[PDB]
Write a protein that binds this ligand. Structure first.
Ligand SMILES: Nc1nc2c(c(=O)[nH]1)N[C@H]1C(S)=C(S)[C@@H](COP(=O)(O)O)O[C@H]1N2
Ligand SMILES: Nc1nc2c(c(=O)[nH]1)N[C@H]1C(S)=C(S)[C@@H](COP(=O)(O)O)O[C@H]1N2
Ligand SMILES: [Mo]
Ligand SMILES: [Mo]
Lengths: 359, 359
């Protein structure tokens, strides 16, 4: 489903979303704020500003040859995933994503860490420094999309941050950042800047509109007339999340057995340890089966698909609800109203799907 | 308020709990599962089993002198903090803690990292290894209290894991582990082993009763006849938590102005970025003022004391509720029933206090 044509925006339909662990490049949700650039490969150069005042300038061929390729399977979830659930409480501003503003791929590229060390930068710095990013895309005024991540993450081996030039074993597609994009695992999609042009180490966060004046969380009392983005931190790691892809709202399933399916995922490398599923509106719960493979501790970048086969009687009504729990034992809240915010981001309240069972 | 005298455990009353950022030693909550050992200081020796069978035997004096002392202000929260709230929904096995199984202190000691590096261990190990601890307290059959943490946390410089021999400037009180205990910042109280006698690296977790068969989160439908501690992970990092320490339930407060106060904290060094407070039972919220200085990122080991000074009208009834949000945007769930578990641990639903304003 496309909810914006210019600038483009697409989310896969639930029927396909959790059918595979690796979301095909053609299915992978697309979020573009600005016109997508047609980057000429030969002339493309990634600039990385040195510590003293220098500049590395790497061609695509250089980025591939001088740094050992590292592959990481990581799920990208946009901050507005499940925004429409929030819009139903009170209107919000933003694209009405449903449950598909999330996808997973095996990413291939150079470690940001290695590129930075290559440019002369050190393993750490006293104080809060940041690594900033600019895309080649730009508004008419010329301001480009940018984001940043704390330096410590940028430099950590374990955090697996990549400057990827491959996606599911093929070069990055145009809509997903060709020829290069940052992929920040366990972090909101907004920071994985596509069509990367520059990487700069700064003592301050990125001055870009989307780092500073967007993608933050506020109290549900905050409205447009009081919002102040200085009172909140930029979304980086995301909270624990889940949703039901099967069955679909209003479905009419046959009696006997029913296989409920969905996804679950948590930020900052935390694995999903359990997914509870209910069929009576959240009053009684059963444990779903997690499909997947344990990732190393603290490096659970990819979602977990789950399923549960369960008896269903003829003529009954169901309200299927799923909630997940991660390695830190963080949980999803019951309702949307108390996590409500004027931008409809950070929508993790329990997902609910009503269906009937045929006679 | 003592919940059991043999073995001992005590929690501070709420009106004292959050008066000071650092909780006074004679007030810091106490949880002992076994008789408190009496330790002669000169003859005490910490045993740390080395990589190829060597044994490092450290006296208290060597531990202080050979490794640079490091201070870390960290909050310990027991897994059963707020168990009674959960009990009341449906009975659970465990000491009936109210909101006080949590306390804060400036700890001083040798970094576990430094001790293991000295003992011959490397920075990292292939696969999952664990660092195990045994205390000097034992059951009649002689099995000691024990716990463990992943090797990666033990060797991480940012994780600030200590072999603490100081607490709020004085040496450890008996009940809190004299002469040495482990302090695992950002992690459940159970792993900070008191009266430490042994440190060992092992490919497996600690076989203690309280690492294998206690302190885990289960689905609400799990009962005693179905529970299986192999299906869940040991509690390490704790979820976001908060409570109201002032006013107290049943209070009749004077009209005009009321100052509501409490604490908020999250595991894993994740700072508390906001605390929402409601006076009308969660229907509307207001942002509290966070007292205390910010810690470095990823290193918020100490709670945030909060407060909200709000105008109140005579004759009105209030239902005070608080909820906190952490650096990962994790949140607390609305209700207790769906996070219910048979041991009454991981009680983080919103805390609610009923008071009224004098007529
Ligand atoms: N340069 C550039 N990078 C960007 C964006 C953008 O509009 N421009 N969108 C961001 C956000 S908000 C999202 S959710 C993800 C989505 O990437 P995808 O379209 O490849 O799924 O990319 C991020 N990278
Ligand atoms: N050796 C020893 N250490 C232990 C305990 C125990 O019974 N024995 N209890 C644990 C748990 S469950 C808690 S919550 C904390 C309590 O620490 P405190 O008594 O210093 O507050 O210590 C942990 N360390
Ligand atoms: Mo996004
Ligand atoms: Mo505990």
């Amino acid at each position: 489903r496309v909810n914006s044509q210019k600038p483009f925006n697409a989310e896969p339909p639930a029927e396909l979303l959790a059918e595979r662990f690796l979301t095909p490049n053609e299915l992978f949700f697309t979020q573009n704020h600005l016109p997508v650039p047609a980057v000429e490969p030969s002339s493309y150069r990634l600039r990385v500003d040195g510590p003293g005042g220098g500049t590395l300038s790497l061609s695509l061929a250089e980025l591939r040859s001088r740094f050992p390729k590292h592959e990481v399977t990581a799920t990208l979830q946009c901050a507005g995933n499940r925004r429409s659930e929030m819009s139903r409480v009170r209107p919000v501003k933003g694209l009405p994503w449903d449950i598909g503003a999330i996808s997973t791929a095996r990413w291939g590229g150079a470690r940001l860490r290695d590129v930075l060390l290559h440019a002369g930068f050190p393993e750490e710095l006293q104080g809060e420094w940041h690594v900033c990013f600019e895309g080649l895309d730009a508004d008419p005024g010329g301001a480009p999309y940018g984001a940043s991540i704390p330096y410590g993450r940028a430099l950590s081996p374990a955090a697996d941050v990549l400057l990827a030039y491959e996606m599911n074993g093929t070069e990055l597609p145009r809509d997903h950042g060709f020829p290069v994009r940052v992929v920040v695992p366990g972090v909101v999609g907004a920071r994985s800047v596509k069509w990367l042009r520059r990487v700069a180490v700064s003592p301050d966060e990125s001055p870009s509109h989307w780092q500073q004046n967007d993608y933050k969380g506020f109290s549900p009392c905050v409205d447009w007339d009081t919002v102040d983005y200085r009172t909140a931190p930029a979304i980086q790691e995301l909270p624990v999340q889940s949703a039901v892809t099967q069955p679909r709202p209003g479905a009419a399933v046959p009696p006997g057995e029913l296989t409920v399916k969905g996804y679950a995922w948590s930020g900052g490398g935390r694995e999903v340890v359990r997914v509870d599923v209910s069929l009576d509106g959240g009053r009684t719960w059963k444990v779903a089966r997690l499909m997947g493979d344990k990732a190393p501790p603290g490096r659970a970048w990819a979602w977990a698909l789950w399923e549960l086969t369960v008896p269903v009687e003829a003529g009954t009504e169901l309200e299927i609800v799923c909630k997940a729990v991660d390695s830190s034992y963080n949980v999803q809240p019951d309702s949307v109203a108390p996590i409500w915010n004027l931008r409809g981001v950070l929508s993790t309240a329990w997902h609910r799907v009503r269906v009937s069972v045929q006679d």
